[PDB]
Amino acid sequence: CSLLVASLAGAFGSSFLYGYNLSVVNAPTPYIKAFYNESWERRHGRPIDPDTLTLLWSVTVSIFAIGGLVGTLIVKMIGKVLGRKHTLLANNGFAISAALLMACSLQAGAFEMLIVGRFIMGIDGGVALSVLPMYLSEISPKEIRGSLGQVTAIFICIGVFTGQLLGLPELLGKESTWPYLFGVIVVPAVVQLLSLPFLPDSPRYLLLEKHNEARAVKAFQTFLGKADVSQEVEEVLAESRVQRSIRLVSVLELLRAPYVRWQVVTVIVTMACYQLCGLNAIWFYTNSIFGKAGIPPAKIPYVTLSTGGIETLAAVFSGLVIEHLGRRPLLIGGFGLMGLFFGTLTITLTLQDHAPWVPYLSIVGILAIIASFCSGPGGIPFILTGEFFQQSQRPAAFIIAGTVNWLSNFAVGLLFPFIQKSLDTYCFLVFATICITGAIYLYFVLPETKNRTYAEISQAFSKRNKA
Ligand SMILES: O=c1[nH]c(=O)c2[nH]c(=O)[nH]c2[nH]1
Numbered sequence: 001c002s003l004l005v006a007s008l009a010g011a012f013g014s015s016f017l018y019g020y021n022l023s024v025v026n027a028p029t030p031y032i033k034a035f036y037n038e039s040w041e042r043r044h045g046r047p048i049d050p051d052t053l054t055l056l057w058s059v060t061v062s063i064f065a066i067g068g069l070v071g072t073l074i075v076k077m078i079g080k081v082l083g084r085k086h087t088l089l090a091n092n093g094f095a096i097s098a099a100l101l102m103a104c105s106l107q108a109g110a111f112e113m114l115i116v117g118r119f120i121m122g123i124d125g126g127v128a129l130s131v132l133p134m135y136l137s138e139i140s141p142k143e144i145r146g147s148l149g150q151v152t153a154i155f156i157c158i159g160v161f162t163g164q165l166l167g168l169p170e171l172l173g174k175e176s177t178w179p180y181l182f183g184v185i186v187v188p189a190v191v192q193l194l195s196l197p198f199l200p201d202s203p204r205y206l207l208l209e210k211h212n213e214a215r216a217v218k219a220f221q222t223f224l225g226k227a228d229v230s231q232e233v234e235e236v237l238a239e240s241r242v243q244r245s246i247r248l249v250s251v252l253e254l255l256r257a258p259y260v261r262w263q264v265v266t267v268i269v270t271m272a273c274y275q276l277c278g279l280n281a282i283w284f285y286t287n288s289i290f291g292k293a294g295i296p297p298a299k300i301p302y303v304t305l306s307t308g309g310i311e312t313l314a315a316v317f318s319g320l321v322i323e324h325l326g327r328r329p330l331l332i333g334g335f336g337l338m339g340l341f342f343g344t345l346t347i348t349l350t351l352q353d354h355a356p357w358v359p360y361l362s363i364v365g366i367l368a369i370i371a372s373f374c375s376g377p378g379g380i381p382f383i384l385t386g387e388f389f390q391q392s393q394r395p396a397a398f399i400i401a402g403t404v405n406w407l408s409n410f411a412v413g414l415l416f417p418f419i420q421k422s423l424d425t426y427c428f429l430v431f432a433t434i435c436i437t438g439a440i441y442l443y444f445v446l447p448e449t450k451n452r453t454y455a456e457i458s459q460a461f462s463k464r465n466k467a
Helices: 002-022 029-044 050-078 085-103 111-139 142-165 178-182 186-198 203-208 213-224 230-244 251-256 258-277 280-284 286-291 300-325 328-350 358-374 381-388 395-422 428-445 454-464
Strands: none
Touching: 002 085, 002 111, 002 142, 002 186, 002 213, 029 050, 029 111, 050 085, 050 111, 050 395, 085 111, 085 178, 085 186, 111 142, 111 203, 111 395, 142 300, 203 213, 203 230, 213 230, 251 258, 251 395, 258 328, 258 381, 258 395, 258 428, 258 454, 280 286, 280 358, 280 395, 286 300, 286 358, 300 328, 300 358, 328 358, 328 428, 381 395, 381 454
């Protein structure tokens, strides 16, 4: 009842928006190119050379990651006072402001306005990604924590699916309709602002500092459906006492701490290889990638729709596959399969003209890549980061992981069109090399984590440290 409604509202408000903004920049790409060309011509009187337009488009696409970086940097400070529901309402404010900033760009004729709107969407996505789990896991009972853990990925996948769906030439792909593609963002924000504020707040955050026992008891009774919640309250108080009994280490000392040097190196490498493995690229430039694959230009958006559908289905299947396969074998197999399928994709791209049916193997390779990602290392690191460290919720580790992820996303988004221009026929070899290198490194480094207490991994890494 209340728990399901709250989880659905929060997911549709944050992860749905993140998925939509991850997979909305590909469909209207030629129209935005034409608008950029016309605007530059009218302002300056000279045409755009293709390289300059490609650089501008890359900046427009990749500024979202810099927005996410600044959002992750600011959320740590904002959450000490704002909280969870207030932070989500501020997130809704950012979302509506950026949506209105983007959707009213063509009318005034401003591309800088579009850039700033995409930047504010980046900060919105960063705040959403850093806030939503801390609320979803908090308001959920420990019995059903895994379900709401996988919901935060199911909803990103469904947002990517609906972003692919919105952009077909019939629905929202016409010349005189592409401005509304960024105006759809209003509806999720409106529904979230209508649903969430009529729900109980996060109990632990208020029970930390303001110490409101009555409201916490009411929220726990509403969530659990019973008036006897003494055990959970006692456990929360014990956890808070344990947390305040131990000093919290910052980023500088964590980087300067030799006893977690290998841990931070491993998490940094895992995040960098996860983001340079390439899925945000295969969302951003799906139309161009499938056009370069020999598929006729009259069927690409339907191919993108199928891509989104198979992504969602792979997420749904992974939701159960994860619980039986494992963590380290699963992640290594995911990276190895991604590398092998990148090899398959590049060999069917290089020699597509040999047989007429070869260009239709690119979509099969794309589905294989997406299945290997979303049924694999796609969601493991979000639990692996907690598994590695002692507190399992270390702010320094979270900040480092977020910074690495956002910088890697920015680099990939900025450099993918350039590597395509350089290696039209073999541009996926770089991704394959990155995937295989990451697989080798994390097979030689990362040990088994599931069904292993923090003491065992701590002593294993202590003997690994050679000290
Ligand atoms: O579950 C995910 N799906 C994605 O499409 C994606 N893209 C990304 O960077 N991280 C994730 N995670």
